[PDB]
Amino acid sequence: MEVIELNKCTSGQSFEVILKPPSDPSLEEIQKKLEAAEERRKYQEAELLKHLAE
Amino acid sequence: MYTFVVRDENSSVYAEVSRLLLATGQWKRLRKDNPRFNLMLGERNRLPFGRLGHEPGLVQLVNYYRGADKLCRKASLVKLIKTSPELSESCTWFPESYVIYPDEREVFLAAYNRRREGREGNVWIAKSSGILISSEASELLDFIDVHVIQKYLEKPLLLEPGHRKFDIRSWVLVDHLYNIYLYREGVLRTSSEPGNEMFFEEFNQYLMDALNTTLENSILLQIKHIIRSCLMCIEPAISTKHLHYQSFQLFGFDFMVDEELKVWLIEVNGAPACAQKLYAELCQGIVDVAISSVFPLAPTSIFIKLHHH
Amino acid sequence: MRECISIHVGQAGVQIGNACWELYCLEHGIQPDGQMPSDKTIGGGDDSFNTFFSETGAGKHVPRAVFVDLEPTVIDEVRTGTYRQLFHPEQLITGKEDAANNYARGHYTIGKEIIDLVLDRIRKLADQCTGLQGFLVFHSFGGGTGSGFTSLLMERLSVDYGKKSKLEFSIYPAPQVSTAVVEPYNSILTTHTTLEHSDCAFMVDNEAIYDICRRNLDIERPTYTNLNRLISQIVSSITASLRFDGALNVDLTEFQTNLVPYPRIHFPLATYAPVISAEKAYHEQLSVAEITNACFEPANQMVKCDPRHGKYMACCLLYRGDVVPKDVNAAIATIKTKRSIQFVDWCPTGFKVGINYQPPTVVPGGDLAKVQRAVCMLSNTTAIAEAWARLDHKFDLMYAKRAFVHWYVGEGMEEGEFSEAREDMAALEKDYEEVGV
Amino acid sequence: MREIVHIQAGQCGNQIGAKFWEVISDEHGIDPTGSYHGDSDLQLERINVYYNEATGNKYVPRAILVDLEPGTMDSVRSGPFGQIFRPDNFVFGQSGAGNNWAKGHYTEGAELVDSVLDVVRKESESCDCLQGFQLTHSLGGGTGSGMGTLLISKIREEYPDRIMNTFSVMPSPKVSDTVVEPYNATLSVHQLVENTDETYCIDNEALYDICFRTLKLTTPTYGDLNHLVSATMSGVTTCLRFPGQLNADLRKLAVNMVPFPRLHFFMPGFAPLTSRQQYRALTVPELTQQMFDSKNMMAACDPRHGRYLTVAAIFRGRMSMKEVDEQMLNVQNKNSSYFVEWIPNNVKTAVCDIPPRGLKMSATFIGNSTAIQELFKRISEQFTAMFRRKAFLHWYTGEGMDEMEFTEAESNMNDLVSEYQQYQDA
Numbered sequence A: 001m002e003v004i005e006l007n008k009c010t011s012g013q014s015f016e017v018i019l020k021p022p023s024d025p026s027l028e029e030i031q032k033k034l035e036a037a038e039e040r041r042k043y044q045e046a047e048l049l050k051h052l053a054e
Numbered sequence B: 001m002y003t004f005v006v007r008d009e010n011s012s013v014y015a016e017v018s019r020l021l022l023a024t025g026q027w028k029r030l031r032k033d034n035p036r037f038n039l040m041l042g043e044r045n046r047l048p049f050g051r052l053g054h055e056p057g058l059v060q061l062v063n064y065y066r067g068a069d070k071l072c073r074k075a076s077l078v079k080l081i082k083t084s085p086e087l088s089e090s091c092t093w094f095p096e097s098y099v100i101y102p103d104e105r106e107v108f109l110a111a112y113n114r115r116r117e118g119r120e121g122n123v124w125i126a127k128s129s130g131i132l133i134s135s136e137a138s139e140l141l142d143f144i145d146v147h148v149i150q151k152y153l154e155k156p157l158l159l160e161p162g163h164r165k166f167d168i169r170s171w172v173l174v175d176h177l178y179n180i181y182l183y184r185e186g187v188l189r190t191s192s193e194p195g196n197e198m199f200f201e202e203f204n205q206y207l208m209d210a211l212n213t214t215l216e217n218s219i220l221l222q223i224k225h226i227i228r229s230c231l232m233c234i235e236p237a238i239s240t241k242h243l244h245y246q247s248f249q250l251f252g253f254d255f256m257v258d259e260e261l262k263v264w265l266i267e268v269n270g271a272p273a274c275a276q277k278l279y280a281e282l283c284q285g286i287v288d289v290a291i292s293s294v295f296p297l298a299p300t301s302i303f304i305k306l307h308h309h
Numbered sequence C: 001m002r003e004c005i006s007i008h009v010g011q012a013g014v015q016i017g018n019a020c021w022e023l024y025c026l027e028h029g030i031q032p033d034g035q036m037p038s039d040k041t042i043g044g045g046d047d048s049f050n051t052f053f054s055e056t057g058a059g060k061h062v063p064r065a066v067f068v069d070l071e072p073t074v075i076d077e078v079r080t081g082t083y084r085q086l087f088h089p090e091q092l093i094t095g096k097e098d099a100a101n102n103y104a105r106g107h108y109t110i111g112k113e114i115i116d117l118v119l120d121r122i123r124k125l126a127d128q129c130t131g132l133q134g135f136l137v138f139h140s141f142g143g144g145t146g147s148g149f150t151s152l153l154m155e156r157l158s159v160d161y162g163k164k165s166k167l168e169f170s171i172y173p174a175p176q177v178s179t180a181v182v183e184p185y186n187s188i189l190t191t192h193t194t195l196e197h198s199d200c201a202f203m204v205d206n207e208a209i210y211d212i213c214r215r216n217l218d219i220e221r222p223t224y225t226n227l228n229r230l231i232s233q234i235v236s237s238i239t240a241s242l243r244f245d246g247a248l249n250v251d252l253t254e255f256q257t258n259l260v261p262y263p264r265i266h267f268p269l270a271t272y273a274p275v276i277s278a279e280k281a282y283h284e285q286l287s288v289a290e291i292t293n294a295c296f297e298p299a300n301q302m303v304k305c306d307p308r309h310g311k312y313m314a315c316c317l318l319y320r321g322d323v324v325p326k327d328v329n330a331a332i333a334t335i336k337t338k339r340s341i342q343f344v345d346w347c348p349t350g351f352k353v354g355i356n357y358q359p360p361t362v363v364p365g366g367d368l369a370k371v372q373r374a375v376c377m378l379s380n381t382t383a384i385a386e387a388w389a390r391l392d393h394k395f396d397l398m399y400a401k402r403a404f405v406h407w408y409v410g411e412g413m414e415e416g417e418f419s420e421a422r423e424d425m426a427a428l429e430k431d432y433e434e435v436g437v
Numbered sequence D: 001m002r003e004i005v006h007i008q009a010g011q012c013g014n015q016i017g018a019k020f021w022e023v024i025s026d027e028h029g030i031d032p033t034g035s036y037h038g039d040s041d042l043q044l045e046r047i048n049v050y051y052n053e054a055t056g057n058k059y060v061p062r063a064i065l066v067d068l069e070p071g072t073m074d075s076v077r078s079g080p081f082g083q084i085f086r087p088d089n090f091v092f093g094q095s096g097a098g099n100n101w102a103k104g105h106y107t108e109g110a111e112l113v114d115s116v117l118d119v120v121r122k123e124s125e126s127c128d129c130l131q132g133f134q135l136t137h138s139l140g141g142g143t144g145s146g147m148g149t150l151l152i153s154k155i156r157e158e159y160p161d162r163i164m165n166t167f168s169v170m171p172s173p174k175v176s177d178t179v180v181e182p183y184n185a186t187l188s189v190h191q192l193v194e195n196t197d198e199t200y201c202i203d204n205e206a207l208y209d210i211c212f213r214t215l216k217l218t219t220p221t222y223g224d225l226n227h228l229v230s231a232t233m234s235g236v237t238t239c240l241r242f243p244g245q246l247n248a249d250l251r252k253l254a255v256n257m258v259p260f261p262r263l264h265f266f267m268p269g270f271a272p273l274t275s276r277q278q279y280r281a282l283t284v285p286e287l288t289q290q291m292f293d294s295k296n297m298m299a300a301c302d303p304r305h306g307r308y309l310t311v312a313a314i315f316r317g318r319m320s321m322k323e324v325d326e327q328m329l330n331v332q333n334k335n336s337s338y339f340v341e342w343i344p345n346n347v348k349t350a351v352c353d354i355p356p357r358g359l360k361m362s363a364t365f366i367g368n369s370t371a372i373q374e375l376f377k378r379i380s381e382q383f384t385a386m387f388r389r390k391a392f393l394h395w396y397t398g399e400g401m402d403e404m405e406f407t408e409a410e411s412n413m414n415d416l417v418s419e420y421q422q423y424q425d426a
């Protein structure tokens, strides 16, 4: 049971008590995956319109 | 109408418990994977405790205590008994044991050499959770190439006529409130070598005719003391008192009796079977105290309530 | 003094944000019109509350916050509420059509059209910061916007603010509190895409806040208002060290340092006590020992689980009110000799303690009673994985039949993202098991 | 500002449609002239979903009335709320469709569809954020069935990203106009399987049984049947029209109710169904039990013969929302065998404070059950009974159709039946 790093001020108080010691993707890569999803949307809609035209 | 699920077909105890629940007309069995259950008779291995108690509008109860394996695994029981301040102090009822990883190798040989030195009984038994009984430390450590080495009771109590060795099995039930209930009926398994099942009534009669004492006074007091010590030790670690689900569990305690009428704890079984003659009585008791207490339906107890704070 | 920018996404994040800033103002003495009489440095300053409030020449203290939602109804409540005078229009961003409870709709379809605008408004606030620490992101797991657009925003923030910390306050889905059937899909989709972008995330299971409101506040059918006021108190005690003078968790970096030794395992459990009903005039004030003990009762945890069957990697105690260090140690010593508190072998067994003398502030007319001392414990226990297991099990049930998958594939998502996300969660569950077993 | 565009086509479509606007107009406090006279804010908060606001605080339904003969639409204009509809939104021909799907879909209807799309385009162009469309029609006639599905196909082509919802009345020999109704219904169901997101299956066989067996009406009229349909349509749209803890829209409904694209045909239910006892107040337990009872289902399918994929329940009136959650959870946990286990928490409940006219509280049931296959089997059998002998086909081949289009229609619906059967044994 040890108390360390005790700091005090007007607002409060903080300390540490020890009981036992121990033993990213770039903007381009993101734009491509977003634009890839938009292509699959546009392709699925084109097939729908092609189907409706028939 | 209460709902329950069965996830351990191999359980002869709860196969009968399920049979009784249906026989009440107030319980309905569901598919094993239906989550809208009030009662789970769970599997022995990898029971998903983490998915219990999250079904809105359903009080859920399971027939196993999460964390009770510490008491039912031989290597864990030894560690629990050695490191628990509430146990390690005493343990006059638990045989001298050591956990040897294939570690307490040096501590075992320290007491072993002390026995062969003094020419004492130096027979140890090693098992795990295949067994070997030997008096040579070399044969024990080579047999295990995780196991535990434990002193073999060289001076056991022998029933006569027959010069037979025996062990006592006690069934203990702990409910969602952590009441400890000891089934009034036990069983002794006779070796039959210098139908291998003797019930308490006969054993009590023998003790009176042979040793001029009763089963309660010479053995049962120590059994109840051992059962209570082991279970009150882990109570804070497994209690479901303020938990989102509830637990009860049937236990199987195994004891040995030496020629001095002293009781020794052998092991604890978390998924025990029952004696064929006692399946009905105990199973009905499980429904009474463990299941219907939480889900009541629409008078001497078969259990001895071991009191505790 | 370093600034923190708060970002609220979706209905849950916006309404929870509205409750936090109402509380912040009460705790700092800021009136709804933004005026702060106790602030003597008019139009500026480097005080501790300036971490969350900028200042105008007229003495208005403006939250460093931005509200974003794909539909306008929820954020319109902010524009009309008591604290409408607090924020300016640029801070409030809304769309026309929401994500319809569809992660793919919030991340790809709809999100792609509004991401740049949000990033710009954020850059505006960042341009007012002398030393921006990072961001606090509030959002739900189950909402189409809260899950889908948040993960998109987190990726872009890691690009535009690489050196800044990002902390999450996430709402875990609970069927009892209005939930869509596909919320398990969204929860796992957004956790996978956001995992390597968040430094520390505080999950709040609505199931927990719900039962705490029913049992401790005697509320029969708690509402979002009830839930949010309780959540705001907890969020307040977590962010208090950033808004007041102190030495514990004084910057976003310290949260990672004190609570997250393993980057992937960055979901600390929060336990809060006491929660006393306001309708209860005769309230027996709880002691330091009694509230510290309650921190180890599952019934007071923001996520229901059993820390007894896990392993702690770190523990922090945040007290507010009449607490003195002596009483805290006398309580720790007692709870150690009674509770099951196992730490991992590669970590010290101890507690970092922080005390703020100002007792918790309760919203006038709310459901929470004023108390003399409260505590919030932040413990990184492997038991929180139980929540991942529940969520991944529901995911597996539906995905085995591909139920509702077509709604996601129909927005541009691929069925493989489902499997990829579930696999990352499988690894996450395994990391917890290798740490606490 | 999520506006919905309403379309009603044919005799049946325009009769249930007119009744729908009379019912909800009363609930929102709008009189036959379009002037508001309610007493609560909840009436006007989401009134924009179904009404346009004209100068003078006038509310005009966003409804488009369509028919190939003027007969029925003249009755609407003469009916109670006839003057509330936008006069320009009356689009009608003079030839009729003679209960012939081919005439409504290919010949007579094709000549009128463009002028309908012109009105639809004018209504949508002035929408802040268009949700989608809801169509009322029967599947047994010619205009609502043939031209109705033609409209759906062309509306989808012009608004591929909007929700298409329909209230579709299924024919039944018990309430029959002509023998070719199975032909027209089989042809339409395929159009619906392909071009709608949500279809409320309103089975005239169930409506007749509810009037005869329950309401004790010896000789039910279409008026009696439409009374049930009005009550149901008011119910399933409550969460779209009023504010509450769950302000729903057409897309979130489709997302949570449709786990597979083709399986989007719902079973509606309503409680109470009291016979004229109209003063006796119902308890929350009684609403919940009746709401799930087959005798309150509008589709004439036995739910216990299939399994529920998803369920939406709406409770209207001032009641214990706590007791509501208790009774709902009681129904599920009691009959959990009739709810598929691979969709967790598939039963959602909503509560609205404002009850319908004449009731202290009500409950509306929206179920996506695999037992709906019984309805499609029924139609398919009646279809095949005639088609095996090519009976009455000349009415259709005379309009340009060939037998192949019939062979494909039957095959498509038998597939639909097989798909429901697949998930009933999953």
Ligand SMILES: Nc1nc2c(ncn2[C@@H]2O[C@H](COP(=O)(O)OP(=O)(O)OP(=O)(O)O)[C@@H](O)[C@H]2O)c(=O)[nH]1
Binding pocket: C009, C010, C011, C012, C013, C015, C016, C070, C098, C099, C100, C101, C102, C106, C140, C141, C142, C143, C144, C145, C146, C147, C171, C172, C173, C174, C177, C178, C179, C180, C183, C206, C224, C227, C228, C231
């Ligand atoms: N605690 C709390 N949870 C909320 C609140 N609002 C919504 N939720 C939860 O959030 C989940 C749904 O996410 P939402 O935020 O409503 O959805 P969204 O982010 O707006 O996304 P979309 O509406 O689909 O565009 C549900 O599980 C709700 O229980 C709130 O105010 N407080």
Ligand SMILES: Nc1ncnc2c1ncn2[C@@H]1O[C@H](COP(=O)(O)OP(=O)(O)CP(=O)(O)O)[C@@H](O)[C@H]1O
Binding pocket: B095, B125, B127, B131, B150, B151, B152, B153, B154, B166, B167, B254, B256, B266, B267, B269
């Ligand atoms: N320390 C010891 N001294 C003497 N005999 C012992 C002993 N430990 C075990 N035994 C013997 O072995 C038995 C218990 O051993 P073990 O735990 O391997 O049985 P088991 O668990 O494999 C099957 P069961 O659960 O029915 O006992 C005792 O009944 C006794 O006969």
Ligand SMILES: CCOC(=O)c1cc2c(n1Cc1cc(OC)cc(OC)c1)-c1oncc1CCC2
Binding pocket: C101, C178, C179, C180, C181, D236, D237, D238, D239, D240, D246, D247, D248, D249, D252, D253, D254, D256, D257, D310, D311, D312, D313, D314, D345, D346, D347, D348, D349, D350
């Ligand atoms: C299991 C499927 O449940 C449904 O249908 C279901 C579940 C949900 C919704 N919805 C649709 C709905 C619509 C309705 O009005 C048309 C009445 C309802 O009553 C519960 C539910 C819904 O809607 N708007 C927002 C939400 C949030 C997600 C929960």
Ligand SMILES: Nc1nc2c(ncn2[C@@H]2O[C@H](COP(=O)(O)OP(=O)(O)O)[C@@H](O)[C@H]2O)c(=O)[nH]1
Binding pocket: D009, D010, D011, D012, D013, D015, D016, D097, D098, D099, D100, D138, D139, D140, D141, D142, D143, D144, D145, D169, D170, D171, D172, D175, D176, D177, D181, D204, D207, D222, D223, D225, D226, D229
């Ligand atoms: N429920 C109900 N069904 C109707 C009504 N009028 C017609 N039907 C049914 O609709 C079918 C006839 O279609 P109808 O609408 O008259 O043909 P259409 O005008 O060419 O579209 C038959 O199955 C009738 O039972 C009505 O007012 N209510």
Ligand SMILES: [Ca+2]
Binding pocket: C039, C040, C041, C042, C043, C044, C045, C055
């Ligand atoms: Ca200042």
Ligand SMILES: [Ca+2]
Binding pocket: C158, C162, C164, C196, C197, C198
């Ligand atoms: Ca980063």
Ligand SMILES: [Ca+2]
Binding pocket: D111
């Ligand atoms: Ca012509």
Ligand SMILES: [Mg+2]
Binding pocket: C010, C011, C071, C098, C099, C143, C145
């Ligand atoms: Mg939203």
Ligand SMILES: [Mg+2]
Binding pocket: D011, D012, D141, D177
């Ligand atoms: Mg007609």
